[PDB]
Point group: D3
Chain length 256, copies 6
């Protein structure tokens, strides 16, 4: 199957257009919507979203990702062939997902070849419908990427900077994601299970417990989350609205 991640929004024809276009090229493709509400142009959030889906997807799955603020410009459209596939703009969007994929090859999609398979013209502002979507549909049915692209160096693709630095014993982490519940996710993984977590920027000591219900309603806590990162949440409340933080912001955190 093919998963879809974009920032197109839900109030319009964009998502539908991409889907029917994909079905034109592969009518029996099983298309799974991850989300289309990724913050406009937010490559980092889009990357986090895909990273999570990729972690639980069956090997052989095709992932189309489209947070393309640079659509129409000279940025490359690539295909990452490996354990699973990634069809995304060469803008760093593949960074997080790549952490969980055994890469075999990378290909730059060639617009002229892709239009050979689609039949319709390639717009300058909607590549998800004219390039990325079709490309995903082609791979799903067995077409090799070589057929519509040229290989490129694996290490020649834009990579985002998502790893945290540490000043002594203090962690300087960043908010890589915020869900609809207001739960805040921080770019810290593989750490040792703390007993407490202090958000030095707020002079708050937090209990580090397994789940929301372990603290009373309205109270804040830290948990190992469900995506292997450090999570900060308010039981039945919004941790984001408390600490009043955003994706991209940095926080000094000390793990006790």
């Amino acid at each position: 199957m093919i998963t879809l991640t974009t920032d197109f929004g839900l109030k319009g024809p964009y998502v539908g257009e991409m889907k029917v276009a994909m079905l034109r090229i592969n009518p029996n493709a099983k298309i799974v919507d991850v989300t289309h509400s990724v913050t406009r142009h937010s490559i980092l959030e889009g990357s986090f979203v895909m990273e999570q889906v990729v972690k639980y997807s069956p090997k052989g799955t095709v992932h189309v990702g489209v947070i393309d603020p640079g659509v129409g410009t000279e940025r490359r459209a690539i295909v990452i062939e490996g354990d699973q596939y990634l069809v995304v703009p060469d803008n760093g969007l593949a960074t997080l997902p790549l952490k969980h994929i055994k890469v075999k090859s990378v290909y730059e999609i060639i617009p002229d070849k892709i239009r050979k398979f689609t039949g319709w013209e390639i717009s300058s502002t909607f590549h998800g419908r004219d390039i990325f979507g079709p490309a995903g549909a082609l791979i799903e049915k067995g077409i090799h990427p070589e057929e519509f692209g040229r290989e490129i160096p694996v290490d020649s693709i834009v990579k985002l900077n998502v790893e945290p630095r540490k000043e002594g014993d203090v962690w300087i982490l960043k908010v890589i994601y915020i869900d609809d519940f207001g739960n805040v996710i921080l770019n810290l993984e593989n750490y040792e299970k703390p007993r407490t977590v202090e958000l030095l920027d707020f002079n708050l000591r937090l209990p580090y417990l397994e789940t929301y219900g372990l603290v009373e309603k309205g109270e804040m806590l830290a948990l190992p989350g469900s995506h292997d990162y450090l999570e900060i949440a308010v039981n039945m409340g919004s941790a984001a609205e408390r600490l009043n933080v955003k994706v991209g912001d940095e926080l000094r955190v000390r793990l006790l």
Copy 2:
């Protein structure tokens, strides 16, 4: 076919993870989204949504519902087997849907027996991806619930208070649901159709008509609705904003 109802939200990887996880267990399950926008942790609301879908669903349909504020706590995860199936947390979510299901037996999902099918660790904060989703996928492909759970008494599961109260011929109804148009659904059903409905708390008299268009724009009415419950609405307006009521509120009502 499997239906999905959650409070997960639309911008995140949550829904996508549960779907690929389900497909990873039953690669050709037909998954139908109901909604993922149920007000956060609102079991009553989630229960109303499931009730409606269950009423029109083909017999044999499997319904996965995840509004689970108590995720990872002592609360049980259950499977209800009958006319159709319900796979939800044991927190009352099944209350309304149960009204339309010929129940044969109920089972408690035993985590370890489930992990034997999935192959991956059960998180403490995302049972929709690690327990409920997989359980639904298994039932869908023919696996009996006994395979991953132990039978329990129907009467043992948690239930919500959903009965309307009547003081003489004044009804004390509860707002069980408000849709995107602001139409207010009150928990009154199977009543003699009135000519007028008066909302005693607002000193309003409303005509009881069959549809929105039967009154001028901006005018308020009461109708049979499409879900067998008494509906209050404003033709092309929002009864919820005009009456300023929220799910859970109680209204003194008299039918003339």
Copy 3:
């Protein structure tokens, strides 16, 4: 394949019911969601959405559209048979889509004939679930529209006025759509590529470029768009935000 376009909203059971009702009629129908977030009762907006999807859908595709403020009134429920199908309320919703369909026949759905196929009572406020959904599903599995309807004149159906007028060298263009990015779409097509677009009501002179990134972040511009309509946008910003416009407004535009 069947497409869906409604103004039902995503926070509710409405979309779920229509779908399970459809799958009940034709259990193996492939249903593709276009959108259910169309502004309440906005027939024009719905019409634009459908037009775009129809242009890229394969021939044979069935399109169910439901933006029905007059549900339950005397307004007709029709089926437009052509190289693609449209199942919609006779309220002008089919106006734009018709521009890309060569119509063969038009039918008026007879409620009593449809009930013979569904088996359940038809409500007064939810025809999408009891009439339109079923109709689309029946056509999808091969049933001829005549079985549940009678032929009517192609030009007897409601039409919206979507044509832009020009006085002198000034275009009076209407905002037929606004997307989640705030990009504004005007009802002007088949025009000669301008160098600059002037929005007289704002004293704004905008550059006509190929894509968003061709200007600085925050700068406004005009583009050929990706839907064959003049598009007013703000690089990574909201054009509708600034111009403070909304679907339906008419702008005086000068093409230089």
Copy 4:
């Protein structure tokens, strides 16, 4: 759903080619094999097979039948549009099936229009793969027959003579089919339940019972059958074996 009935045989690539050709036109078509073992060029036998399948197929079903001894000659290739479809060579193959289809229109497939859809050259000896298969597939995904054909008179098509004649009290019945068990099927239907059936050509008086087991193993009998035609059988034996008959022979039968 599309059904297939041919005389291609099972020891070859013929059936495989027609199928992959069809899936090439409509990759998600559900193809159901009826039989490909019809006696070579036996149009009558093919017609009986199709009749039976048509009687139980759901409305909307497309039936491709290919028993084509005159492939490549001037014989027409037609499409019979009704509450069910028939895609067959105009050689009388549709005779029996028509008895259960209310015909709406009949078309003559235009080779050049079909080639526009397939993309490959049309052979002279394998139209099932290059014309009929494609035609069925196109209709299945929603393309109207008119796109690749022109309407022709319903009664302008070849018909077989399948009516049984009666002289006095003696029926002259034809063997329209013989199954793998050797059970013989005569073209007599809508007759009053006899007590005994006499096969004059054999001086055999047979008992008319409900099923095989109602007589001794090895004994011959007559039954109402399961296809609404008089059936001559031998309990766990071959009736055609003994009577030494074959599809096409005419038996003089007396109904007592």
Copy 5:
């Protein structure tokens, strides 16, 4: 999915009729043909065939088996609910398959209930199309057997005698199956790997090797087979035509 095993034959409409009937009741059922060439009325061979398929089928699979010489008589039509399902005539056909199924319940299908789900009349000679097939299709979509049958004692079903006896050191086995290659299968399993195998009825000593190619072309051998029984084969020849044996025949075999 549903598997199908019958003795209907391939030259006719029987198999097709059952399939379309099943799709009427469950149009998205995945139907897999095991075989339809089981020797007429041969319950033992039919049982062996099913036993093998059941061994490799996914849990939850539904198996419809129809070798029904007693069709129309008073023999019971049952459903065996367990690890997997068996929908077959109560004539011993379930014997072998039951060896690999964790049985939960057994049900006698009630003709009157089944016709409630089908809509068409139940013939006396074709229960595969009017009872067994529909029943299989119902279970595949989630309907419980209780819905169209009444439970009966697990041990009240006809069982075939398939186990071998042993006179001292000599085995008196029977031929339970013969494939198209002429390979002979004998009802002996779980035995200790012999070095030689003597067919005392022919005064032949046979090498007991892993596969056909281990002996020269035309030579006979014994192997553990691929179905866990003792197999007798002629490399690239017919072992059945040599020993000139049939299904059901007994052979005195001594394992050295």
Copy 6:
């Protein structure tokens, strides 16, 4: 989509086992039967059948072919990757199909790596169910062959002699296939179309016409055929029985 071609035969559990085994690995693989009636162990015949199917198959199609007399021996099991995929035993079966596949690489299936995917023991006499079928199902769902095999040189695989020989202007052609009608296919292709074809060995002169019907019933002709090879046939008769030739025989032929 996956096609299947074998010499398994039609009456047995062999084909059914391979299909459920495949579905057990890839539950939603679309499996298309070509034939299972290839003359026992005839690699040449099996190769011809696959060639034809491959010619009309959509790019990306996976073709599983099992005619494997050397099953369980030293013979390798291979996967050929390219335009489409071939999964067959390394015994020459791929010879003809290879002519129509743009080969990218070839792999040898490593038994132990395959068992890691299936979960069950590999038999010594049924690799179609334990190796070839599973391998095809894996490729179909996106698994790269590298995952269960090691690359090998294209030129290393076994190949059949299939070239036609010419002695001056007499051709020495081979009967590469005979279908169910008795039409004889000779291994001659891309030749200047003749007016007459004389079979020197029978002192027969045959007209070269486009189809069967162009000669009287019972008469013999030569035609282009539908598979690009020279075909000899008898209008409504059997050229194979008239010439009394079998696959593999050689005929001295001259084109005038």
